[PDB]
A paper describes a structure:
[name], [name] its mammalian ortholog the checkpoint kinase 2 (Chk2), are key effector kinases of the DNA replication checkpoint. [name] contains two forkhead-associated (FHA) domains, as well as two SQ/TQ cluster domains (SCD), flanking its kinase domain. The phosphoepitope-binding site recognizes an epitope present in DDK24, whereas one of the lateral surfaces of [name] interacts with the modified [name] domain of Dbf416, herein referred to as HBRCT domain due to the presence of an additional α-helix at the N-terminus of the domain. We generated chimeras expressing the HBRCT ([name]) [name] [name] ([name]) domains in tandem [name] solved the crystal structures of these chimeras in the absence [name] presence of a phosphorylated epitope derived from [name].
Since we have previously shown that a peptide derived from this motif of [name] (pPEP, 480DGESpTDEDDVVS491) binds to the [name] domain of [name] in a phosphorylation-dependent manner in vitro, we used this peptide for subsequent crystallographic studies. Crystals of the ternary [name]-[name]-[name] complex grew in the P21 space group [name] diffracted X-rays beyond 2.3 Å resolution. Similar to other structures of [name] domains bound to phosphorylated peptides, pPEP is bound at one end of the [name] domain [name] interacts with residues in the β3/β4, β4/β5 [name] β6/β7 loops. The phosphate moiety of pThr484 is held in place through hydrogen bonds with Arg70, Ser85, Asn86 [name] Thr106; the pT + 3 aspartate residue (Asp487) is anchored through a salt bridge with Arg83; [name] the main chain of the intervening residues is further stabilized through hydrogen-bonds with the main chain carbonyl of Ser82 [name] the side chain of Asn107. The [name]:[name] interface is similar, but not identical, to the binary complex. Binding of the phosphopeptide, however, induces a small rigid body movement of [name] around the two interfaces holding the complex. The HBRCT domain seesaws pushing helix α1 away from the [name] domain while pulling the α0/β1 loop towards the [name] domain. Upon binding to pPEP, the side-chain of Lys118 (interface I in [name]) comes close to the side-chains of Asp123 ([name]) [name] Asp149 ([name]) stabilizing the interaction of the C-terminus of helix α0 in [name] with [name]. On the ternary complex, Lys200 (interface II in [name]) is not hydrogen-bonded to Asn112. Binding to pPEP pushes the α3/β4 loop of [name] closer to the β10 strand where the new conformation of Lys200 is stabilized through hydrogen bonds with Gln126 [name] Asp128.
Residue numbers in the entry:
A (entry chain B): 1 to 9
B (entry chain A): 103 to 217, 231 to 362
Amino acid sequence: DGESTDEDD
Amino acid sequence: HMTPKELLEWQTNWKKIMKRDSRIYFDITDDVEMNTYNKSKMDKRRDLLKRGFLTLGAQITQFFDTTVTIVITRRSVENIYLLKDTDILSRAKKNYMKVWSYEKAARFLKNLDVDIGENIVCRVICTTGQIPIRDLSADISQVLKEKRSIKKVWTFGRNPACDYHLGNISRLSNKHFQILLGEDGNLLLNDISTNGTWLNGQKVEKNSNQLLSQGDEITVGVGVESDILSLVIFINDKFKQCLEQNK
């Protein structure tokens, strides 16, 4: 867990 | 979408039905084949549900009999039309019996109220419903001994080690936003997220402290309708008084 965030465009 | 009063009435009536007119049968048949692990996990889940309904005063019958009012099953409720005519779930259905999944049963139990020396600073109510009500608290003693302008910090994020877990949603940051305790019981919102934070429907400037007010709605996950998570802040006014009392 503690993954990298899914950035928006 | 029901009024609070309507939902309460819905609860009051069901509570009576559980205690007087309810006889529940748990389906023993499983549609998948599972290792004895997952099976003993679902068996533990069954026992929880049983205890929950017993607390509400409902009968638990061990047989699919003439009296059953609710059938609780693990199997697919939506694919009961595919089962054999001899199946208990098929017979219950075509006789208009109530058939619930485990998830539905647990939710029902939750709806019927089944499932330190530091004062309340504020109460956080999730109005989207993913999270139960939590209170932010702080020790009046520790707060008054701090000379810094920020007395305490609460972090909100996907990281379960944060002070407030926003849930596991990929679009949310491990540390999304913070709530800071200002000097006189004032509360500030600080967005440190990647995809942003909203306050009363307005995107706040990142890394900028914005004063919080009574009933202010904090929303994250905007952009994807099902990632949206709203938190309403209710600030405890007596906290300011226990702070002014202990000067």
